[PDB]
Design a protein around this ligand. Structure first.
Ligand SMILES: *C/C(=C/c1ccc2cc(C#C)ccc2c1)C(=O)OC
Length: 138
């Protein structure tokens, strides 16, 4: 029974650098971030409403655990602790609204969707800007 469960590898990444600009990241780091983003792998274990997600590059890995509908702490795309909450939008799309623990900055959110043709699509939004990363089953 195919759901979000599996090992995914990035095949495209539109607007990553623009998003990091909105998050105040300096040019050079933006450019390295982009280079490193072509090696993004994602591992998802899913049972019902409940998700384990590991995202790794060449040199960094992180894990989140969440239940749909339950608040949890994570990091934004610019690595600040935030409050996060995930809701379904349809059978195989979910959206996440984030609010900052401490401090001021852009409105962030993200979405994961499992298309009919077997891709995983990730959007990440900072204010006006929308990054789109497409993944395929490893
Ligand atoms: C599930 C997930 C994956 C993902 C992909 C790319 C990311 C880039 C950065 C940066 C900088 C942070 C987190 C990423 C996470 C996700 O939910 O991301 C928000």
């Amino acid at each position: 029974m195919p759901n979000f469960s599996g090992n995914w590898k990035i095949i495209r990444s539109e607007n990553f650098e623009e998003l990091l600009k909105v998050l105040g990241v300096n040019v050079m780091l933006r450019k390295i971030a982009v280079a490193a983003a072509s090696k993004y792998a994602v591992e998802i274990k899913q049972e019902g409403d409940t998700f384990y997600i590991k995202v790794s590059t060449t040199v960094y890995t992180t894990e989140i655990n969440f239940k749909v509908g339950e608040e949890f702490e994570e990091q934004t795309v610019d690595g600040r602790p935030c409050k996060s909450l995930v809701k379904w939008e349809s059978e195989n799309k979910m959206v996440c609204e984030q609010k900052l623990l401490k401090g001021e900055g852009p409105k962030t959110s993200w979405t994961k969707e499992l298309t009919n043709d077997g891709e995983l699509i990730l959007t990440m939004t900072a204010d006006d800007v929308v990054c789109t990363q497409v993944f395929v089953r490893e």
